[PDB]
Structures are given as C-alpha cells and as structure tokens.
From a paper:
We applied the strategy we used to determine the Dam1-Ndc80c interaction, by generating chimeras with the C-terminus of the Mps1 peptide joined to the N-terminus of Nuf2 as a continuous polypeptide chain. The Mps1: Ndc80cdwarf chimera crystallized in space group C2221 (a = 72.5 Å, b = 168.5 Å, c = 229.6 Å). We recorded diffraction data to a minimum Bragg spacing of 2.9 Å and determined the structure as described in Methods. The N-terminal seven residues of the motif (RRSKRFL) form a short helix, which has a set of contacts with conserved glutamate residues in αH of Ndc80 and with conserved features of Nuf2. In the crystal structure, the guanidinium groups of R152 and R154 both bridge to the carboxylate of Ndc80 E166, and the side-chain NH3+ of K153 projects to the carboxylate of Ndc80 E162. The conserved phenylalanine, Mps1 F156, inserts into a hydrophobic pocket lined by Ndc80 L169, L170 and F172, and Nuf2 M154, with a further contribution from Mps1 L157. The C-terminal six residues of the Mps1 motif (LGPAKR) extend across Nuf2 αG, with contacts from residues 128 and 130–132 (conserved in point-centromere yeast). N128, conserved not only in yeasts but also in metazoans, anchors the end of the motif with hydrogen bonds between its side-chain amide and the main-chain amide and carbonyl of K169 (the penultimate residue in the motif), thus mimicking the hydrogen bonds in an antiparallel β-sheet. This interaction positions the invariant arginine of the motif to salt bridge with Ndc80 D295, likewise conserved in both metazoans and yeast. Residues F8 and P9 together bury the hydrogen-bonding interactions of N128 with the main chain of the penultimate residue in the Mps1 and Dam1 binding motifs and probably contribute both to the strength of those interactions and to correct positioning of the invariant arginine to salt bridge with Ndc80 D295.
Residue numbers in the entry:
A (entry chain D): 1 to 115
B (entry chain A): 113 to 318, 621 to 682
C (entry chain B): 151 to 171, 1002 to 1153, 1407 to 1451
D (entry chain C): 6 to 98
The structure:
Amino acid sequence: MASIDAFSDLERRMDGFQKDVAQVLARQQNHVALYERLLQLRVLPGASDVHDVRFVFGDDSRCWIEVAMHGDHVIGNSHPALDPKSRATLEHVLTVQGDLAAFLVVARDMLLASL
Amino acid sequence: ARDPRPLRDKNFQSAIQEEIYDYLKKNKFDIETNHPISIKFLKQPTQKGFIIIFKWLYLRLDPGYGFTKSIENEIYQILKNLRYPFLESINKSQISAVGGSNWHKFLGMLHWMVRTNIKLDMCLNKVDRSLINQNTQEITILSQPLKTLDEQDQRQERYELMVEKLLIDYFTESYKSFLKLEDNYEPSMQELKLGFEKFVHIINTDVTSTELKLEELKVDLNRKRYKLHQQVIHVIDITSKFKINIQSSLENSENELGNVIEELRNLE
Amino acid sequence: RRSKRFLISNRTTKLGPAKRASRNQDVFPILDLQELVICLQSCDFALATQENISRPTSDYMVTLYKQIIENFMGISVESLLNSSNQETGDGHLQEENENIYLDTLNVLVLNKICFKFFENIGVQDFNMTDLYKPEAQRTQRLLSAVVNYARFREERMFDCNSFILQMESLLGQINKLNDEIKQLQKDFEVEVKEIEIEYSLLSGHINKYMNEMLEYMQ
Amino acid sequence: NLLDNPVEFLKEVRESFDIQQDVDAMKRIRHDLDVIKEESEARLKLYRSLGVILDLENDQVLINRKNDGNIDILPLDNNLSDFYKTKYIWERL
Ligand code: NI
C-alpha cells in the first residue's frame, strides 16, 4: 500500500519527470533559420520554375542568383548583371566536380561587387 | 506403608520431646489443664497424662469438638478424620496402652499434632490476609491505566466484591443483634454507611484518573489529526504546482513549434 | 452476578418472614423435615431428596456445607485452600514434609470457616464430625439455623437496595468513560484509513500520468 | 483550523488531474516536429553540402576543410556580433 509518509518518493519522481520534460522539449530548435542567420543565404524558388533554386545574398536581398539542379547545373538569371567572362568562370567552377560551395563563394563575390 | 521418620532413634526422640515441651510451655499447657509438663514425663508417659496432651492439642485444632469420657475409643476416628498419613502403622489395640514398647508411634503423633497446630495458625493467618487484601490494595491497583479490556473487567469485579463484603457484614451483625432480642439494627447500618463511604472515595479517584486519561487522549488525537490534515494540504499543493508546470511547458513548446513551421512556410 | 442477587424488592418473596421463638432452648424455631426442604429448593441450593437429609451421608453434607459457605459468607472454598498453602519462599520448609500436612490443614481450614459461620448464626459447637460423620438430628438443628438467617436476610435486603443501586451508577460512570476512550480512538483510526485510501489512489493516478507521458516522449 | 472534508478534497484533485489532455498535447508536439523535418530536409541537405554543420547540443558551428582534414569550431555566446559569425564561416571554406 501507499502511505503519505512515502510522499517523498513520488515527489522525487515528479522532479525527474519535470526535468525530463524541459530537457526533451528544448532540443530541436530551428536549423534552417539558423543557417540563414549565419550564412546570410536563403534558398527560394526561382520565380520562373518552381524547381529552380534561387540563392539570395545579404539582408537587403538585392543580390541573387539562380541555378538548375537537374542534369548539369546551368547558371540562370541574376539581378546583378554579370559579364560573360564572369558567367563562364562561374560555370567553369561547376564544370569541375568540386562542390556547390565553391561556386557560391565566387558568386557572392561577383554579385556583391557588381552591385 | 510405614513411618519414614526414625521414631526409634534416641537422638530423634530427644529432639521431638524438646519441641513438644517447648510448645506446651510456651502456650501455657500446665496453667489451662492444671497438669505439670516436663521432659521426663515425655519419655515415660502415663495413660492418663497422654489423654490430657492429646485432648489439649486436638482442642486447639477443633475447638467445638465434644469429648466423651471414653477418650480411647475416639482417638482412632479422630486420626481418620484428621487424615493422619501414618494411621496404618498404628494399631487400634495400642491406643489403650501407649506406655509400652510402641510409645514411639504415639510420640511421633504428638509431635505431628504439635507441628500441625503451629502450621494451622500460620495457614489461618494467610487466609485472613486473602479475605482482607481485596479491600487493602484500594486505589493503588485500580488507578493505574488499564492495559487490556480484561483488566478493566477485573477492576469492576473487585468493586462488586467490595460491596458484597459490606452487605454480608451488615447481615452478620444484624442477625447477631436479632438473636439477642433487639430488633434495632441501627449500629450495624452505621457501620455499613462508613464502609460504603470509603468505596465511593475509591471510585471517585478512578473517575478523576480516567477523566484525565480521557482529556489527554483528546489533546493527543487533535495533534495527530492536525499533522495528518497538514500533510494532506501539502500533497494537494505540490500536485497542483506539478500539474501546472508540465501544462505550461506543453503550451510553450506548441507555440514555439507553431511559429517555426510558419517561418519555414512564409520564407518563400 | 455479584451484589446484584442481593437487590430485590418484590422479585422473589420466596421466603417466609423471619421467626424467633424465645421458648425452645435454641433461639431458632427448629424446622421439621418438610419445611426445611421447601426453602433449599426455592433457595439457591440444590437438594437430592428430602430423605437424603433425614439420613445425611458424609459426602453429601460436605457438598451442601461448601455451597452454604460460598453463598452466605461469599468466599470460595477452593480459592482459600490455595491461598492457605501458598508456596512459601522460605528455605526452612521441606517439600517431603509439606506433603504430609497439605491434606490435614486443608480439612482443618474448612472446619474453622464452618465453625465461625455457625458461631455467628448461633451455634457455638461445630465439630469435625458434623461433616465427615453426619447425624440426622444434629443436621436438622444446624439446617434450621441457616434458614432463619436466610429469612432474616430477605427482610434486610430491602435496606441495602440503596447501596447496590449507587454502586451500579458509579460503575456505570467508569464504564461510560472507558467506552468513550475506545470510541475516540476507533473514530480517529477510521479517519486515517479513509485518507490513506484516497492518497493511495492519487499516487497511482499521478504515476500513471507520468508513465503514459514518458512513452510518447523520450 | 482544519479541513472540513480532507477525503473529498483529495478526490477532487485526482479527478481534475487530466492525463489525456497532456498526452494529446504530446502528440501534437511530436506531429509538429515531423512537419519541421519534412519541410526543412531539402534546405538542410543543401546547407550541409556547403561544408557547414550545426551542433546545437554544444552551441557550436562545425566548418570542415575537406583537403586539410582539420575542422574549425565556432562557439556562440551572448556577446558576439552577427557580422563576426557570418564573416568567419564564409570565405573560410
Ligand atoms: Ni514536500
């Protein structure tokens, strides 16, 4: 049977369940919003094709570029006008295997400078 | 059977004759019977002197007994009524002549009656204690707190015994006055009233003693009930606080997650 | 039923009025054979036959005398014999010598109690042969004395109803207080069990709440 | 001074201790987490491929150089500017 003198055992279990709820309910947070705050980069639709990804740089969102993911990644439209030499070198980064981040480093540098 | 005592031993006969002579001298046998007693007479007694000692010792055991002039014929029946354990070793013909060679059998009986007379006085004194003790311990035994229900019922039986004794003493004294042609049992009633007063004083002490135990139980039970009720309020408040804390945490997570989903959808 | 038997007003009235005769040598009116047994049947004792007292046996008279002592004097013959020969702690007595005097002193104690009781009622000559060698004529005188003490007791028991009733009132007060003490403890003991049951229900409900919630989380 | 009905007060607390309400609330929280994972896996897979990995259990940011093999860690505290965080992780890889 349960006696009132044994309330400390239920009190101890209540403290454990009280701390387990607070610890579990504070794990996930938000990862995409944190990525957009740290990298200052947003992934949005391309306004021309819903499957076209648009990369937006800066808080003012004046500079943006768009690429296609299907097949070989071909560079799309961009708000800052890019010379054909700058556009060919950006696709040349994607021509090599490399990585998508290497293309974004060159893209952010050219779009912000062309602003 | 036969007497286990060494009745024929000369050293044992000198010891029992000394015990007989001392008891007869200490209890004034020579003054009451007008017959001198001596240690020399106890070794070589006479038939007339033996009857005087036997009648004197038995009269102290059974005072109302009526002795016939033929005392020899009654000694065997008296010993049988007295439950003498050595009646088989004594012949009925030896009673008429106790001064012969079988005197040691009768000398051992005289010492047996001397020991019985002394042991009877001590046994009757212990009976007087038992018939008095039930009114002697008074409140000392009864005022103590009862341990079980049987001791409380035993306490009531002692009170009923006290009242019953008082009534019997009134009936005894009133009849004795009635036998003396009086028909005025006033002094017997006054003794009953004085005895009944002490019984009321003893009961009143147990009533006051029990009234204190009743009040001590009330205060102790109120303290026990207060602590129990305090523990109940504590369980109720701790449970309510624990319920609100978990419910508030669930509402916070639902609102924080609901905004995160809205942020993932609005950013388009 | 002690001291309650003595409380009568018109409950019994089974005994005739107490009579005394200044004529005969004994102050008691010597009852005959028939009038002596009409009480002892209505009176609390028990009789085998009216002829059994006309020829009194040794064993029946000791039984009848023991019941008379246990009724009029209010003492137990067996309890007094146990207290008369209580085991004494003195180192002088011998157990082998004690076995001899145990039977002799037990019969002598019964004699002194019967001799004292008959002395108060008006018989100063009580022998040891009055029990172990009963006589037809001598028993009639002894039994005629105890019945006159019984008629006299019934007339005097009306004057004692005051004391008996006041004893019941005082005894009832103590029993009432002790019943309240047991009632107060029983009521509180029930009060605790009812609360302990509800708390035990709450412990099971709270523990079930954590166990079900612990399954969906973690 | 005391409780008028301590037995009934304990019964009221038990009858008001709702279990299904909080269990249903735990279902909605678990459902909201499943919605967040599904709607953010596409972006998180693109962010993770950039070379930046988030470790929210240690409040740190993981930036790994695939050629050097060494990993840089950015711990967060309530004294760092947002421009400091964005300039260190970028142009580093
Ligand atoms: Ni507590």
